Design a protein around this ligand. Structure first.
Ligand code: FAD
Length: 304
């Protein structure tokens, strides 16, 4: 139309997306409905899946995050700083009523070289929540991990640990829900890297997804302490990807292929390493190429 269109058109679903509806000064006070440990007792970290009531007052979209202000005060009697957490539920939610939001939280605990145990403020606060407890929420936040508009896109999801969160959100909308305006028929390929089998988050859910959409969904796990490749190397996410290096490289050259990466900071290095060798097989500089993919919204990263 002969209408004014000054702004730039993205390839992601930005229409109707809201950010920072609730801020630290006046957060939304939700309530814990459920909180379940989803890792095995032998897992080295301990991750919990929790659901909060929102009364539908927080219209978040798949891929966004919310902030959590843990109860308590710091030394100066001031509130705790906000900690961000990727939303692990679809917009409709685990209860299917558009009135809740779910988080996938790893309890941060470690011993320093003094033998002293240190505990993260917000992660331990969240994991200790009991149904009925109040929680201060802010946001929603983020535009980086929003889903592609293309219902027939090839979506490659690379995740480590809790980085699986935004992808569980994607996948629920793609395969577990009926949307009259969005019918996914592309290819969803998930790569999830964790240390042990007892750390395999939402495995049962992805299994049911593979069952009802066998030709639209593929999953590959990388358990570093239990698997190894022919060369005898630990199976990290990049190591598993290397088994499909030919296929992944070919997919990246397509216009409807979108890569999303979420998880532990540093996972990008290992992935770049595998890409640099592939890129030079065609006389291409990976970093110059990645920059191009980014401009086209085909390489989205959110690590921490
Ligand atoms: C966009 C975004 C999305 C996120 N999504 C999620 C999510 O879905 N799930 C999730 O669990 N977290 C997520 N996080 C991380 C989360 O925001 C917190 O950083 C994390 O929970 C730790 O906060 P804390 O208050 O418990 O600990 P804090 O008291 O803040 O303490 C952290 C301190 O410990 C150090 N530290 C951090 N990790 C470790 C470690 N593994 N071992 C040793 N020392 C460490 C830090 O350098 C820092 O000094 C996300 C972060 C961002 C920015």
């Amino acid at each position: 139309p002969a209408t004014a269109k000054a702004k730039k058109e993205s390839k992601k679903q930005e229409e109707g997306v809201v950010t920072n509806l609730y801020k630290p000064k006046e957060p939304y006070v939700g309530r814990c409905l459920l909180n379940t440990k989803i890792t095995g007792d032998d897992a080295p970290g301990e991750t919990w899946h929790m659901v909060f009531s929102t009364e539908g007052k927080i219209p978040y979209r798949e891929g966004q995050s919310i902030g959590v202000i843990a109860d308590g005060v710091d030394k100066n009697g001031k509130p705790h700083k906000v900690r961000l957490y990727s939303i692990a539920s679809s917009a409709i939610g685990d209860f299917g009523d558009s009135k809740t939001v779910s988080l996938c939280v790893k309890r941060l605990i470690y011993t320093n070289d003094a033998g002293e145990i240190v505990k993260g403020v917000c992660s331990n606060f969240l994991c200790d929540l009991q149904p009925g407890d109040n929680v201060q929420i802010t946001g929603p936040v983020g535009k980086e991990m929003l889903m592609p508009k293309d219902p027939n896109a090839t979506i490659i999801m690379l995740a480590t640990g809790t980085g699986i969160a935004p992808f569980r959100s994607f996948l629920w909308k793609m395969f577990f829900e009926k949307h009259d305006d969005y019918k996914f028929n592309g290819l969803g390929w998930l790569f999830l890297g964790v240390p042990t089998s007892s750390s395999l988050l939402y495995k049962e859910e992805f299994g049911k997804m593979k069952e009802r959409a066998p030709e639209n969904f593929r999953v590959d796990y990388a358990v570093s302490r239990e698997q190894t490749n022919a060369a005898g190397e630990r199976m990290y996410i990049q190591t598993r990807m290397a088994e499909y290096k030919e296929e992944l490289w070919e997919l990246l050259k397509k216009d409807n292929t979108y890569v999303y990466m979420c998880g532990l900071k540093g996972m990008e290095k290992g992935i770049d390493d595998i890409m640099v060798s592939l890129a030079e097989k065609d006389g291409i500089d990976w970093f110059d190429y990645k920059k191009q993919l980014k401009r086209g919204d085909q390489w989205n990263v959110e690590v921490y």
